[PDB]
Symmetry: C3
Subunit: 68 residues, 3 copies
């Protein structure tokens, strides 16, 4: 009985795949982190009004096409 | 022959790493889900025109700097 | 001693989990790729000014509420 050699290569095989996965997992984390740090902006309200961007918020455009 | 004890701790080791990976995988999924639900907006056309945001779309600013 | 059968099912078990993980990892990659390709836009400056979008950049709205 040497089924200990087949079991060994089988564990070695799984271990390699786990190493590859740990790598893709690390890559994924760095990509998600960058996406999170990009500071993207959410959608403007969907209320039939036009919006412009100011101080991290959507402000009504008509607000500036009037004095006040 | 006790190489069954070394094989056991080796499987235990891989299993722990797989547990850690399952965790980072779950964390990644929750982060990607939130990024997907944030409702970010795509780029405006790159055609030399100015755009404002309205009803989930980029509309030409000049459209409002005119009556119609 | 058949602890070789228990070790076998244990490796089989870990291998299945590793297969599931490889799948969730692949799914995550396709989702992150799409998020990266969506071409979202970063925040406008936070300087108290109103901005509109033009040619892949935030341009001051007042720039168009004046001839030049």
């Amino acid at each position: 009985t040497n089924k200990i050699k087949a079991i060994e290569t089988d564990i070695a095989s799984v271990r390699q795949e786990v190493n590859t996965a740990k790598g893709n997992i690390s890559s994924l984390q760095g990509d998600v982190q960058a996406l999170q740090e990009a500071g993207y902006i959410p959608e403007a309200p969907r209320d039939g009004q036009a919006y412009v961007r100011k101080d991290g918020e959507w402000v009504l455009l008509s607000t500036f096409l009037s004095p006040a």
